Structure formats: structure tokens, C-alpha cells
Amino acid sequence: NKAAVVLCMDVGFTMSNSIPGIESPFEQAKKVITMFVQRQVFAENKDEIALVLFGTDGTDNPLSGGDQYQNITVHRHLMLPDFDLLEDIESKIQPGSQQADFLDALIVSMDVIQHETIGKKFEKRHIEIFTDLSSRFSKSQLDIIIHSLKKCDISLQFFLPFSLGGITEQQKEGLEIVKMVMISLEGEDGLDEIYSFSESLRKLCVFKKIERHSIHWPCRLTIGSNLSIRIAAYKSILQERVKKTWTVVDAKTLKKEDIQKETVYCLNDDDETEVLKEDIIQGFRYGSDIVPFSKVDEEQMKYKSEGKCFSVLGFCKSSQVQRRFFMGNQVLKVFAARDDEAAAVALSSLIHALDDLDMVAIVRYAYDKRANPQVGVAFPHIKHNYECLVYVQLPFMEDLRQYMFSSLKNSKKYAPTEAQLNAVDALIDSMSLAKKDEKTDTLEDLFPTTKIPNPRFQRLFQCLLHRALHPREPLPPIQQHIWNMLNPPAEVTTKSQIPLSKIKTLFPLIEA
Amino acid sequence: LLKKHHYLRPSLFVYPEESLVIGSSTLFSALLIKCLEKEVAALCRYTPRRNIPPYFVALVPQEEELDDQKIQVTPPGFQLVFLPFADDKRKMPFTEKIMATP
Amino acid sequence: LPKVEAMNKRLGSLVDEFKELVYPPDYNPEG
């Protein structure tokens, strides 16, 4: 539910002395931490974050002792992220002129995360390290550090200015130490858990997606009146909308409670009489006349059904259920009931039978008592890991539109010639978005659109952030990376340059 | 590569107009024929109205089908199917796989 | 609405055999 993240940083003088082109680690670290804080604040997952720095002039830690545990400062404690952290990161954090042992930073962070985690149920505890590993240090307490890390089940993560994991001996020794630490904490899998600054910048440039949790829907799949299988349904695919809506506030005082919206009803007479909300009724239109139909009368005459019904109306061949007829705004994934072996066996048997016979189930679905019944299709979906039914709504008789369109093949004036067909074939061949893997096993997708985050939320978050930090400046333009991710690889365009020219030459398109 | 279970919205129908741009019908027919021959669908970015975020959609060609009485039941054109985004998908609880005897 | 009578009549004893094969004599659905 919640996680505690103690971000360790190095604020020594070593990074400041670097080639300007390399974009010295100070600015990269500030950028990555700023993006991380932005993602955390704009995605409210209730995660606590604290900031610790080692290599600064000042000293402020719970433990002082002797010369050790010095030049280390805990700037922020475990608390919910807020814009004040971003403001402090932007300017309040400045480089120092001292050096410190990152081992001391690690012990300080362990002390902080152990002392301030009391009274809160945190299932995760990640400690991130940001340093150049170019500061002289001595190794004399790694045994106890590893023991504490293992006992407390604290995950460790590292970032360095280099990808490997052209460096000095001190950097090599630091790399050896970090690699040994990761091998001890996790092992072979932990070697790759060291991420360069640029690689992190690559993956943290996009705001976190809106992750809603679907509540399980228990019901019973019934075939007749004697067979019943306990099932649980979840919402797999649906259109996602913003969780927070815009609130209208008075322009001057900027307060919600200063505005009140209300509606009134007045007659159509010349005098414009006033009619109260208790002096009106609901009605409908029947041709050229109007028939009153009160709400109580409608409820009395309303169609009444028994809610929570998942009944198999029948079984039909998959070829008779076309994809173009799918309706609704949801897709349901139906699994067996949790902790139920008999239900799982029955559902697996039904799914396997349907798959073998190439059949689907036409069924009736109703969410609850006050939900309109629906007729839908459930079809099997078998994977190496799990198998489940997939339910999608189907149209009624009233939902079908009978439109007649002129034929194109038989049209005499709309018949393309051989050259046009050849050019279109060339265009299609050049603009292929799927590539065969050396004609060996299968295809591979060049432009998968399912993994692209929705640009609407990204733009909204960007503009909200820009207004929050810069109340006076106007909104910025759309970021370039959004456009890049919303467009295909440049190779497709490069290949299609010439076929498109041929299409333009052959086809005489004119606007009227 | 188009998943039948990746349903997000009802599909639409795209048909040449031949009233705003002349010659569009020939190109549309050629595209339909070639797509049917090569079994491909045209991926596109769709923006219905002004001030609306774009959506990634796919155009699947449709082949004219007539009944015994020569009555249209499937008009020729393109079927516009909406493709879900990354956030449009929801994670599922992990369930152990229980098999069934033949 | 499913035709429960017709489905019951068509499935003479298949449901009973399926229940015996799958459901042990202790399982209670809808409970």
C-alpha cells in the first residue's frame, strides 16, 4: 500500500569538477530526483519520501559520535511528497566543498528509515544511492551492514555516471565495493540493478499511468437450472478518465464555497409565471401529442428483473459472432471463484470444450437489480499461465442500422488501373509496421500502440506542474517526446517517401 | 496482431464521399483491394472533433457480401476499430492454473 | 431469459454425470 524511499545523494566537490559536455552528475541527479518527485506527487500512491545528502559542509544527523557520521545532513524526513520538496530541490540544494564516505551515508539512511518507520505499515523500503564513487574511503564495517540489510529486508539501488556495471583507480575500487554489496544483498540478479543516470532519464520522462483497481464481481454461471459454477468477473479494458474534476471557483477570492449553482422552471406564458420543483412532472412524446407519465407510475410499470444473473442462453459457432457487432464500453474477464478447486475444474472443462469445438456462449448479463439486462458473447482465452472467459456485449434488434452503400468493385468510373494497384501495393509494402524475425519464428511489432501512455494525462500533468511552479508564465508547448512516441519510427517514413510520390503522381486528386 | 479481446468502443464505418475531393473513390477502392489481398489493416491516428485527444485506430477492409436474394448485408468500406492505450488495461489477480481431465 | 425447461429436458442426465465427475459429494454452490 505504502513504501518508504530514502533518497541518498552526494553533494561533494568531485562532481562539480567535470567536463561541461558530460553534464556533470550534479545536474543529472537533480533532474532525475525532480522527475521522480513529480511522478510521485502527480500519482498519489501514498508513498513517503525522505532526502539525505553526504558531502556537504554542514552536519545534522541523529548520531554524531566522533569524526565519523560527519558532513551528512538529513534534509527531509519521511512524509507525503509535496511541491515544497520540488522547490527545495530546484534551488535550496547547492553543491558543497567537502568529501564523505558513502558507507556513512548508508548507515545514516538505515538509521533514519528504521527510526521513522515506527507506527506505519510499509511493505517496501528502497534506498537509492547517487554518487560518483570517486571519494577516498575505507571498508571496515560491511559485514554488519549486510547483516542489517538482510535482517530488515531493505532493497538497495545504485546510480553512477557510467553505464558499465575510462575511470580512475578510486572509481574502480568503488565499483568493486558496490558490486560486492549487490552480490551479497541479492546475487547475480542484483548486478543489473545499477542504473546509469542517462538510462534513468530515459524511463522517468513520462508520468505514471492512471492505475485503477477493479473490484471482483462474484456470480454463478448457470447452464439450465441444475448446473452452476461460481465465477468472478473483472473489468479488463475500459476507457480511463481523469480521477479529479475541475472545480469552479470565484475569480477574485478563489474559493469554492462562494459560488452556488441552481436551476429554476418558468411557464411559457407571457407573464412568465414561476413553477416550483414540486409542481412539475415527467412526460414523454407520443407522435404529435404529449402523454403524462409520472415517476412513481413509471417505477410501478418499470421492467423488473432479478439482478446478478450470468446465464448461458446458448452455444453458437464463433464464425456467427462478428467483431464489428461488439457493443458496450467494457470487456469482462471471468475466472473461477477464489480458493475453489471444483469451480476451477468446471470452468477449465467448459473453456477447453469451447476451444476444441470452436464455439462461444451467448449469455445474459446483469450487474444488479437496477441494471438493464444485456445479451453478450463469452469466448475462451487460453494462455500458458492462465485461462479465462472473455465477455463482450452484443447488439439488440434496435441497435442495428440498416444502411445501403453503393458498390465499388462494380462501379465503372471508380475502377483503378493496373499501375494504380501496383503503386498502392508498393506503398503498403514500404509502410509495413511488422517485421519478420529473419523469417525464422514469428513477427515483431515495430509500433505497438497498446504500450503508449495516453498523451492527454501527460499534457494535463505537465501544464498543471508548469502553472504550479510558474504561476505567472503562460502554458508551455507540447513536449517533443510526446510527439515522438505518437509517431512511427523514421525508417517507415524514409522508406515510404518515394511510394507516396508515385501515388501523388498517378492519382489526380483535386479539391472542390 | 489485432486482438479480438482488445475492445474499447463500438466500431465505425469509413466510406468515400466523392463530394469534397474528386478521385478519392479510386484510391479508396485500390487501398481496399490491396489490403484485402495482403490481409493488412491501416493503422491511423483519429481526431473526431476539434479539441479532442487523438486515438490510435485501425481500419480493417470489408468485402461486399450478398445473400441469396442479392441483398446487401455487409457494405464495402473500412471498419474503424479503436485500440486501447496503456492505461486502458487493468491488472488482474494471479490465479493458479487448475487443469481438467479429458 | 433462458429456457430452463427446454435445457433441463434436453439434458436428460448429463448434468448429473458431470457433477459426479467434478463436484465431490460435499461441495455446495451458492453458499
Binding site: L313, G314, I362, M397, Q402 | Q69, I71 | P2, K3, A6, R10
Partner: peptide, 24 residues
């Protein structure tokens, strides 16, 4: 044209709904 409805010209006549009818 064959199958044209006699109430609303220009629209195909819809066959009455038969629900589910099990085959032999």
C-alpha cells in the same frame, strides 16, 4: 426491391425475433 418493408420505404424489413431455437 425484394424484402423492402411496406411501412417504411427504403429500409430493409426486419425478420421477427425468434430468440433461441435448438437445432435437431
Amino acid at each position: 426491391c425484394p424484402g423492402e418493408s411496406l411501412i417504411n420505404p427504403g429500409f430493409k424489413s426486419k425478420k421477427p425475433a425468434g430468440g433461441v431455437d435448438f437445432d435437431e
